[PDB]
Amino acid sequence: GWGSFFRRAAHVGRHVGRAALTHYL
């Protein structure tokens, strides 16, 4: 709508959001 103010309260779900390629897992 005006900016989809929702997930911004946690940026999707962090972790995978920011990065994860570092984890050899």
PDB file of N, CA and C in Angstrom:
ATOM      1  N   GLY A   1       0.812  -1.204   0.000  1.00  0.00           N
ATOM      2  CA  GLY A   1       0.000   0.000   0.000  1.00  0.00           C
ATOM      3  C   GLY A   1       0.847   1.256   0.000  1.00  0.00           C
ATOM      4  N   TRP A   2       0.980   1.876   1.168  1.00  0.00           N
ATOM      5  CA  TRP A   2       1.775   3.097   1.295  1.00  0.00           C
ATOM      6  C   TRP A   2       3.261   2.760   1.321  1.00  0.00           C
ATOM      7  N   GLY A   3       3.573   1.523   1.690  1.00  0.00           N
ATOM      8  CA  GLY A   3       4.952   1.082   1.755  1.00  0.00           C
ATOM      9  C   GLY A   3       5.068  -0.326   2.305  1.00  0.00           C
ATOM     10  N   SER A   4       3.930  -1.005   2.416  1.00  0.00           N
ATOM     11  CA  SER A   4       3.915  -2.368   2.934  1.00  0.00           C
ATOM     12  C   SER A   4       4.609  -2.434   4.290  1.00  0.00           C
ATOM     13  N   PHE A   5       4.183  -1.569   5.206  1.00  0.00           N
ATOM     14  CA  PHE A   5       4.771  -1.533   6.541  1.00  0.00           C
ATOM     15  C   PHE A   5       4.333  -2.747   7.357  1.00  0.00           C
ATOM     16  N   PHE A   6       5.180  -3.774   7.380  1.00  0.00           N
ATOM     17  CA  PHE A   6       4.878  -4.995   8.128  1.00  0.00           C
ATOM     18  C   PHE A   6       6.158  -5.767   8.426  1.00  0.00           C
ATOM     19  N   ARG A   7       6.682  -6.446   7.412  1.00  0.00           N
ATOM     20  CA  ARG A   7       7.903  -7.227   7.571  1.00  0.00           C
ATOM     21  C   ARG A   7       9.060  -6.339   8.022  1.00  0.00           C
ATOM     22  N   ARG A   8       8.943  -5.041   7.760  1.00  0.00           N
ATOM     23  CA  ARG A   8       9.987  -4.098   8.145  1.00  0.00           C
ATOM     24  C   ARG A   8      10.214  -4.132   9.653  1.00  0.00           C
ATOM     25  N   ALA A   9       9.251  -4.689  10.380  1.00  0.00           N
ATOM     26  CA  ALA A   9       9.354  -4.775  11.832  1.00  0.00           C
ATOM     27  C   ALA A   9      10.392  -5.817  12.239  1.00  0.00           C
ATOM     28  N   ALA A  10      11.020  -6.445  11.249  1.00  0.00           N
ATOM     29  CA  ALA A  10      12.031  -7.459  11.524  1.00  0.00           C
ATOM     30  C   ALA A  10      12.766  -7.849  10.247  1.00  0.00           C
ATOM     31  N   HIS A  11      12.525  -7.102   9.175  1.00  0.00           N
ATOM     32  CA  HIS A  11      13.172  -7.386   7.899  1.00  0.00           C
ATOM     33  C   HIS A  11      12.989  -8.851   7.522  1.00  0.00           C
ATOM     34  N   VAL A  12      11.795  -9.184   7.033  1.00  0.00           N
ATOM     35  CA  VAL A  12      11.491 -10.556   6.637  1.00  0.00           C
ATOM     36  C   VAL A  12      11.659 -11.505   7.821  1.00  0.00           C
ATOM     37  N   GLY A  13      12.906 -11.839   8.134  1.00  0.00           N
ATOM     38  CA  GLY A  13      13.190 -12.732   9.241  1.00  0.00           C
ATOM     39  C   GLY A  13      14.666 -12.753   9.583  1.00  0.00           C
ATOM     40  N   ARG A  14      15.378 -11.706   9.174  1.00  0.00           N
ATOM     41  CA  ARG A  14      16.810 -11.615   9.443  1.00  0.00           C
ATOM     42  C   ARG A  14      17.515 -12.908   9.041  1.00  0.00           C
ATOM     43  N   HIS A  15      18.691 -13.139   9.616  1.00  0.00           N
ATOM     44  CA  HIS A  15      19.455 -14.344   9.309  1.00  0.00           C
ATOM     45  C   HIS A  15      19.615 -14.505   7.797  1.00  0.00           C
ATOM     46  N   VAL A  16      18.795 -15.368   7.202  1.00  0.00           N
ATOM     47  CA  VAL A  16      18.862 -15.598   5.763  1.00  0.00           C
ATOM     48  C   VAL A  16      18.805 -14.276   5.005  1.00  0.00           C
ATOM     49  N   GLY A  17      18.062 -13.318   5.550  1.00  0.00           N
ATOM     50  CA  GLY A  17      17.933 -12.018   4.919  1.00  0.00           C
ATOM     51  C   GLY A  17      19.275 -11.331   4.754  1.00  0.00           C
ATOM     52  N   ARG A  18      19.961 -11.106   5.868  1.00  0.00           N
ATOM     53  CA  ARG A  18      21.264 -10.452   5.834  1.00  0.00           C
ATOM     54  C   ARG A  18      22.255 -11.275   5.015  1.00  0.00           C
ATOM     55  N   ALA A  19      22.624 -12.442   5.536  1.00  0.00           N
ATOM     56  CA  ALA A  19      23.566 -13.311   4.841  1.00  0.00           C
ATOM     57  C   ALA A  19      23.616 -14.684   5.502  1.00  0.00           C
ATOM     58  N   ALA A  20      24.308 -15.620   4.860  1.00  0.00           N
ATOM     59  CA  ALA A  20      24.424 -16.972   5.395  1.00  0.00           C
ATOM     60  C   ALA A  20      25.461 -17.773   4.614  1.00  0.00           C
ATOM     61  N   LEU A  21      25.903 -17.223   3.487  1.00  0.00           N
ATOM     62  CA  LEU A  21      26.895 -17.899   2.657  1.00  0.00           C
ATOM     63  C   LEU A  21      28.157 -18.189   3.466  1.00  0.00           C
ATOM     64  N   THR A  22      28.293 -17.513   4.604  1.00  0.00           N
ATOM     65  CA  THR A  22      29.457 -17.707   5.461  1.00  0.00           C
ATOM     66  C   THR A  22      29.416 -19.083   6.117  1.00  0.00           C
ATOM     67  N   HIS A  23      28.219 -19.516   6.498  1.00  0.00           N
ATOM     68  CA  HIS A  23      28.055 -20.816   7.138  1.00  0.00           C
ATOM     69  C   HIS A  23      28.344 -21.940   6.149  1.00  0.00           C
ATOM     70  N   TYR A  24      29.351 -22.749   6.459  1.00  0.00           N
ATOM     71  CA  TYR A  24      29.722 -23.862   5.591  1.00  0.00           C
ATOM     72  C   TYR A  24      28.589 -24.882   5.517  1.00  0.00           C
ATOM     73  N   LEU A  25      27.610 -24.734   6.403  1.00  0.00           N
ATOM     74  CA  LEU A  25      26.475 -25.649   6.433  1.00  0.00           C
ATOM     75  C   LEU A  25      25.828 -25.733   5.051  1.00  0.00           C
TER      76      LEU A  25
END
